[PDB]
């Protein structure tokens, strides 16, 4: 199936037809993109908080307005999907979701309240697409740049009434019903160790330092439990590259940072009237990110390599987490750099899929964020910053939907694109929960 | 070709799979939506400033979060498109376009600077899709709820260096090179009268009261000139319904209001901390809305009827203008009501297209706006308001990208959806200029 090779402005932006992205009619290419045959594998790439605005800002800065992200923009089937949550007490819609509810929606097929993981408004557990995939025998992978206990990666393997329930200690006071010592299934980190996906890579080594309050591994740190349960623990790129196999007998657990893995690009924080009073910024590569710390692209590629050895097929979810984090921190450079980071991973995925032929690749976000691209002369009430793009022009970003600590989320529907068998299911308007059913039906799971 | 009959949440939002909008695999339906055959007609519906956020806000309020706009959401082929303009002096991209440059982009196929109409950065005129369609012998219609002189409807029939050049007087001092008395082609209203589309319906009767400074009709008001040039002048719904034919011999010109046509819904303006300090708002129908003033749906339906009598085919552009106007005025109810209004016109277009079979219907916006849907408890620096949705829940809207007077535009890419032959060309990432080429090619124009 054809992948959009190039959708950059074809010529001189200033001349007639020079800004065009199409070189001819697309009917035939679209026909060839449609297939209902079964999917052997599925790679779901999530850009945390990556709505259309974030994609545009990143493209403008890193590739120029007439540019083209080889990964993110290359998926042929596109659509828009709704991601509202539910109010726990009333059951009515709550228009602006958080990452927990949204992650639950696509991972279990049911709407829930803000902050829940793998449970509905009645606090009932529902099997995740990963658990189901593992049950059917497929290999499973879960990769992220955030703390593995964070919402997005946690939703696939944990069922807790509150996302804050990272380890034993926090769970005991915030999720008493889930607390291990109270007959619950355990904390997020604990349920993660139980779920046993073949490949799990990301940050969050900190919580693994906690000690189990009850159960078979009481007294032992969660890391010791991992080792004792046969997990292959990796903590740097070198070690990651050395892994030859990862399976149920010896699952891979890569903890590359105590918390969130390092951001790719550094830049100052947006300030009040920053586009007016401060000069234009040019982002700079983060020097503390390490040749020893794998990038999302490397983690993705390795994961694909190990997971592909299972002839049954595989399910892999990859998350570019810090797009959302930096967006919250009103830091344009960090936000854009993580989007660029995600793009590289989408490329890795698309390459593998293009040759394998039976892989469904999906790129989307969990929810919309606050960043907006405004006129250079804008006098906004919030935080702003001017950036020097690849076009050699200035672009101004504004974060003005919150006064408090962190810029907030928004309820706008957002882009979802797909490539491979069953991709037609992301076209037009759909809901985040349809994604669970699309992945399930594509994999022929029951 | 199938039209999305229903993509509303199929069941109980709170139950597994109840939020789903899909009821089965879409591959086959999408395959049936692909056709490369020639388009006999084209109906372009523009929601001024109607980005994904505006669409979601209006859907949440009027149809509920799991609801479905029968028009707007019913188009099967969807994608996102870029609309940046150019800096006149440098020729580099200017990330946030205004309505003039964007309307110029799709109407002529060339990028331009903010404020320009039908001319490039060198101020050179370029033929519009309407002029070209009229030349090839097709019937043409230009419909809007704004003053006919405003950017969107003007771009199809006028070529001036500044959008402010409404009539003789303003032209003489702001567009001297275009001023009739200086050998120019004339003001926006004057060129509109020259272009002679078969059907032109909208507001802006005020400028028609100005008198020609030179030329054959010097001394006469533009209204008199219209009458003298054989135009059928209509000023209300009754007269409009009475028109039996509209052609080059007797073109239809409907001036239904002095300026912009009345807004559909009334509601208070968003205020600082309005979601906190004031109660939730329920929009109410504008009593001045009227029985003698045609609605966008009525104008669209009448236009289609008159235009369809030309066997060669027709080109019609319809614009829901006040979506952007109200968005600027930080008035949620006006904004949303105009989106509901546009939806009705999209339904009429789709109905006709569905049965005619050779019509390309495109629905999109010229540029993205400011409005954002934020959490109910949000403490924003700008203007906000709480609304009582059809769900019986509260939705808060934030306007916080400008301090001054008006909320500004944004540069995020936005939704474009299509139905009919050649619709495949709106899928994936495209540029607003590609739309000119898609309509040109579809129509077989040269
Ligand atoms: Mg998130
Ligand atoms: Mg506009
Ligand atoms: Zn967030
Ligand atoms: Zn505007």
Swiss-Prot record, chains A, B:
Q: Which UniProt keywords apply?
A: Disulfide bond, Hydrolase, Magnesium, Metal-binding, Periplasm, Phosphoprotein, Signal, Zinc
| Annotated Mg(2+) binding sites | 48, 150, 152, 319
What the entry lists under Pfam families is as follows:
Alk_phosphatase
Q: Does the keyword Ribonucleoprotein apply?
A: no
Does the keyword section mention Nucleus?
no
Q: Which GO terms describe its molecular function?
A: alkaline phosphatase activity; hydrogenase (acceptor) activity; magnesium ion binding; oxidoreductase activity, acting on phosphorus or arsenic in donors; phosphoprotein phosphatase activity; zinc ion binding
BP GO annotations:
protein dephosphorylation
The cross-references to InterPro entries, in alphabetical order and at most eight, read:
Alkaline_phosphatase (IPR001952), Alkaline_phosphatase_AS (IPR018299), Alkaline_phosphatase_core_sf (IPR017850)
Q: Which residues form the active site?
A: 99 (phosphoserine intermediate)
- Xref: CDD domains: ALP (cd16012)
The free-text cofactor remark is: Binds 1 Mg(2+) ion.
**Which amino acids does the record list as binding Zn(2+) 2?**
48, 366-367
Show the disulfide pairing: 165-175, 283-333
Assembly, in brief, is: Isozymes 1 and 3 are a dimer of identical chains, isozyme 2 is a dimer of heterogeneous chains, one of each of the subunits from isozymes 1 and 3.
What name does UniProt use for this protein?
Alkaline phosphatase
Source organism per entry reads: Escherichia coli (strain K12)
């Amino acid at each position: 199936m054809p992948v959009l090779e190039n959708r950059a402005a074809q010529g001189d932006i200033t001349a007639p037809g020079g800004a065009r992205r199409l070189t001819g009619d697309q009917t035939a290419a679209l026909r060839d993109s449609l297939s209902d045959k079964p999917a052997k594998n599925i790679i779901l790439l999530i850009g945390n908080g990556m709505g259309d605005s974030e994609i545009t800002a990143a493209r403008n800065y890193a590739e120029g307005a007439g540019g083209f992200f080889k990964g993110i923009d290359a998926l042929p089937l596109t659509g828009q999907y709704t991601h509202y949550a539910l109010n726990k007490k009333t059951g009515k819609p709550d228009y602006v979701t958080d990452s927990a509810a949204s992650a639950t929606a696509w991972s279990t097929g049911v709407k829930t309240y803000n902050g829940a993981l793998g449970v509905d408004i009645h606090e009932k557990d529902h099997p995740t697409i990963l658990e189901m995939a593992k049950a059917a025998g497929l290999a499973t992978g879960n990769v992220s740049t955030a703390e593995l206990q964070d919402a997005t990666p946690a939703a696939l393997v944990a069922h807790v009434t509150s996302r804050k329930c990272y380890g034993p200690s926090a769970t005991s006071e915030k999720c008493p019903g889930n607390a291990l010592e109270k007959g619950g299934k355990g904390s997020i980190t604990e349920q993660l160790l139980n779920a046993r996906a073949d490949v799990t890579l990301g940050g969050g080594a900190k919580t693994f330092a906690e000690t189990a309050t009850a159960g078979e591994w009481q007294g032992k740190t969660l890391r010791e439990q991992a080792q004792a349960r046969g997990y292959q623990l990796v903590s740097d790129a070198a070690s990651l590259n050395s892994v030859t196999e990862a399976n149920q007998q010896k699952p891979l657990l890569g903890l590359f940072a105590d918390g969130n893995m390092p951001v790719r690009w550094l830049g100052p924080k947006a300030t009040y009237h920053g586009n007016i009073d401060k000069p234009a910024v040019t982002c700079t590569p983060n020097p503390q990110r390490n040749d020893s710390v794998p990038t999302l692209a490397q983690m993705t590629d390795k994961a694909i390599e190990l997971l592909s050895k299972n002839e049954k097929g595989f399910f892999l979810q990859v998350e570019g987490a810090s797009i959302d984090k930096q967006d919250h921190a009103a830091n344009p450079c960090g936000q854009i750099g993580e989007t660029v980071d995600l793009d590289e991973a989408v490329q890795r995925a698309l390459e593998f899929a293009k040759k394998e032929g039976n892989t469904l690749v999906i790129v989307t976000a969990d929810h919309a964020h606050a960043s907006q691209i405004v006129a250079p002369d804008t006098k906004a009430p919030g935080l702003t910053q001017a950036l020097n793009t690849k076009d050699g022009a200035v672009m101004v970003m504004s974060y003005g939907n919150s006064e408090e600590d962190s810029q907030e989320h928004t309820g706008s529907q957002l882009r979802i694109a797909a490539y491979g068998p069953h991709a037609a299911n992301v076209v037009g308007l759909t809901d985040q929960t349809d994604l669970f059913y699309t992945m399930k039906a594509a994999l022929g799971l029951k």
